[model samples]
Target: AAQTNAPWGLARISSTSPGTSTYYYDESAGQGSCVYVIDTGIEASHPEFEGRAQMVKTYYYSSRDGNGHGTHCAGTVGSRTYGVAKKTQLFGVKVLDDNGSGQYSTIIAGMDFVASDKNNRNCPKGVVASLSLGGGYSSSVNSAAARLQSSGVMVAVAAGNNNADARNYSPASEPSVCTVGASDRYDRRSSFSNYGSVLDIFGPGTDILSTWIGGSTRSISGTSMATPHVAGLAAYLMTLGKTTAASACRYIADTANKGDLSNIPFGTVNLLAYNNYQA
Candidate 1:
């Protein structure tokens, strides 16, 4: 009696209809791609990651995920079971502290590390950075993110949970970043998700289940939860010949599911992130 039960978000992305519950994806999904989760930190030993997740750079005082936010986000990006890109390499770039808060300088330091690591000849062919954290507008953070993307890393950032215009946020407002909003199982915009023309697309964010600290899993909600899904898809697309940041961003926007979201705000595109898995 073999049974398949996929996460609602994963199921939703694979099919055009929300009624479907199967998560369909390519067998070679995200192979040879790298995703950097810039947040608190990841519990690299969590079973969900299948030993593929590691803390490559830590700006915090330690390397452990005391807040669980980063581990949850990392799981959504490329964990063995809960991930969008099942085979992508997961790197935790810990910018946020144990309390899930950090200054903009620490965030910049994390991006700087990713930009430099991406240039190493031995690194993976395709790289994507998932930023699930944001704050008020900051020119320094935005500039760092721009530099990171210019260095050839496809960047996906949370469009904030303010329910205000995403243009008010820092890296999310950064034009070069792939800003993602939050949608739910019903294909409705999450009540707290930031919107506006700054958003590139939407992803499932409400009641999302993912890996957590101490080798466990938990359900959480936020635009933070939505961004990694797009990042994972970016990494997956890169393996499919969308090799550069700009190309992957273009393909994602062009191929995203359209006109399905409910209650889309003014200045926001109604596009929802899709995995391009038709089965």
Candidate 2:
């Protein structure tokens, strides 16, 4: 029942301002570069994405109707000003269909497709894959995620939206993954975000307004929304010289503004000092 339209800009908070320039910036996302997004198929005709999306591939793991979770996430990450990585090319892998669920094999196959694109000249020079869904943790998932990481693919996964520990999922638990948690406009952890030592960093996720299916707009909450913020950050970091996934993760963590977590039981996550660490 989610609508398809661009969500509103992020709310302004004392700790953060909407559209306030940050140290991370990527001036060249649209120079024929691509980022593979493993989610539901994107609405290519969206006005915000005019000639922006390049659907390199799509895989619908399940047959279902118009569930709009993946589309919403895509808009958040790549839907022009409505998105964080507007200029970057987006290759959508529809592992999760309209049903919003998918098998592990389907997810793995999607990863394989993107990883194999390293040799393709038409493909983006680098790829930062974003997974907004996750399940219980598994060693096999960790190994597979590490394999992708080792292969030079930058992987970002949501730390789940259940507000529980993240150790229960595949890629989220994997150290190789840039496990992302959610924070509100004030830089406070969203009550719904999953937390644990596995969490690498936090991004805007609470009450986020973004594009949905059918050319309409809506507001949704979850770590899913937050994941794209990190993905966009990754793209920006890549431009800043942290081209590799590991280095990009380090840059994000190192540049994040540290918040007071003492008031909260889970503690705080800090951004790297941007001025000091150039690349």
Candidate 3:
């Protein structure tokens, strides 16, 4: 069930954080589903946003899109004109810096905050944590994700841009969450997207166009670009009352595009993600 609760918050990851951390609930679409982008942060005022972004700053961002990666990823997930769930609520938790990198522990902290969000006093039952970043493997994150999943949070991680095996990466290889790979508009596995049996699904990634900093949009390539599609869809599914991560994932997998992948052997040949799901 892609579900959400009526609740909100405004605070900083720290007094010295990137910017003033804040939150607001939007009900136009997504039923107020909370989909948090854990990345370089976002430019909430972008024209594409149309003022429905409710962001949360991490220990690093100050409502700034230093790298624009987070903003771009978030756009694909919830922008009124570019997203699958155009009205889905948006939140930014920066773990990466302007250079597009961050501490692994900080990544965990962002996830933990999203998992608990004690500050918001809201339901964690149907939250979706979208990750457009990944590196080496980490059982620490996986362990925490296992607990978050039980607490009603579903995580979507990128398979990586390594062009190797997803099994060699962290959340992509982590069984506690849904890991994704990149697919082309033509339904082909992207040349650079990581592959492996560990990956759960594939989404449009190569040359993706979405919101960026300075009220602009840019095209990007990578599994990072693909992860949010699953995240947005997962958030949308929960609003339909799919109560658990497993249940939401099952619906996505069962309804995905089936057939041989253009780049087979990198992921499941029949698991291309489809956003327009029906109840």
TM-score of each: 0.96, 0.83, 0.83
The lDDT values for all models are 0.88, 0.65, 0.70
Q: Any residue pairs clashing in model 1, and if so which?
A: none
TM-score, model 2 to reference: 0.83
Cα deviation at 51, candidate 1, in Å, is: 1.3
Angstrom error at residue 106, model 3? 0.7
Cα displacement (Å) at residue 57, model 2: 3.2
Q: Write the per-residue lDDT of candidate 3 for residues 138-196, one digit (tens) a residue.
A: 88866666666666677888999888888778767887688888876555788998888
Give model 1's clash tally: 0
Worst 10 residues of 3 by lDDT: 6-15
lDDT of 2 by residue, 151-254 (tens): 77678888898877787877789987788888765556788888887888877777887777777767888988888777765764564455556577766777
Candidate 1 positional error at 144, Å = 0.8
**lDDT by residue for model 1 (1-279), tens:** 111587888887777878666788876778888999999999999888888888888876798899999999999998877888888888888899899999999899899999998665233558999999999999899999999999889999999999999888989999988999999899999999999998999999999999999999999999999999999989887877755676677788888899999999866899988877644
Indicate whether candidate 1 or candidate 3 has the larger TM-score.
Answer: 1
Q: Among these predicted structures, which one has the highest TM-score?
A: 1
Answer with 1 or 3, whichever has the higher lDDT.
1
